[PDB]
Structure formats: C-alpha cells, structure tokens
Amino acid sequence: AYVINDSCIACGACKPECPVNCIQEGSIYAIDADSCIDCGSCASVCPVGAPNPED
Template identity: 30%
Template sequence: MAIMITDDCINCGACEPECPNNAIYEGGVEWAISDGTSITDDYTLEDGSTVDASDKQNPVSDEFYYIVPDKCTECVGFHEEPQCAAVCPVDCCVPDPEREEDEAVLLGRKERLHL
C-alpha cells in the first residue's frame, strides 16, 4: 500500500528529502510524475488517466505535506522500510488503508518510475 501523511503533520519537511521517488510535496505545491523520476513521456496513472510526465497536477493537500500515491513505492527496492515514516518526528506517515498493494505492485511501480 502507499504511505499517506495524516493531518497530525507538523509540516517539518523531514520526510521530503528522504523519498527516493520524489513523491512527497509541501502542501499546496503542484506535482509532476517527472519530478525525480526518469519518466519523460506520457504516463498512465492508477485511475487510468494518462498525463504528460511534466504536466503539473493539483496538490493532494493544501495544508500539509502529502505523498502522491502514483509515485509511492513504500521505498520497496530502495530501503528496508519507508524512509518518510522512519524520520517523521510525529509518526504521521502511515500506510494508506485505501491503497493496499503487495510488494510486486510496488516493485513494478519503481521499475516504471526509474527506467
């Protein structure tokens, strides 16, 4: 499953530089699939829509740091545990119950994001 940041976030920013997929953004900041990945062309999101990798997308949250689920691999293939959760001082980086994914799905996403 992807990791999510709860509203307990204190906006410290400790998580953002730890993400190997550049999936974490400050609240209110637009995101793109191409940020921190090797994707340069169209990319199909999990909802089935296709976006140009460099097109800016609406923020997931305007108030708190957030994780883009389409870019989160729970650090599978990079680290033993999600690095955002490891460094979070208030333990607000938690598994998203709406996005249960097995290791094969997460590894597949890592391979698509980092060609």
C-alpha cells in the same frame, strides 16, 4: 502507497528522504500515491509519525 495523516506539523524532514521524490509540501505534506514505492523512509524520519501505509 503511504499517506501523511493529520499529525503532520510541516517540518519538511520527509521530502529530502524520499528516494523517488513523490512528497509535496502543503499545510500538511502530501504523497503522490501513484509514484510511492512503500519504502517507508518518510515514516522513518517523521518526528510525529504522520506517514503511514494507506488505509
């Protein structure tokens, strides 16, 4: 799964780009790890590179 790190500026760009809609809005956005397919689309549109493969 991917994880949205502290860089997140809560722009909202990644949510509509997630093919399985597993991103939730918050102070910083968060991924529902169990549904994430590691497609990387969120990482692709993020202006600050917050979404990265989980550690």
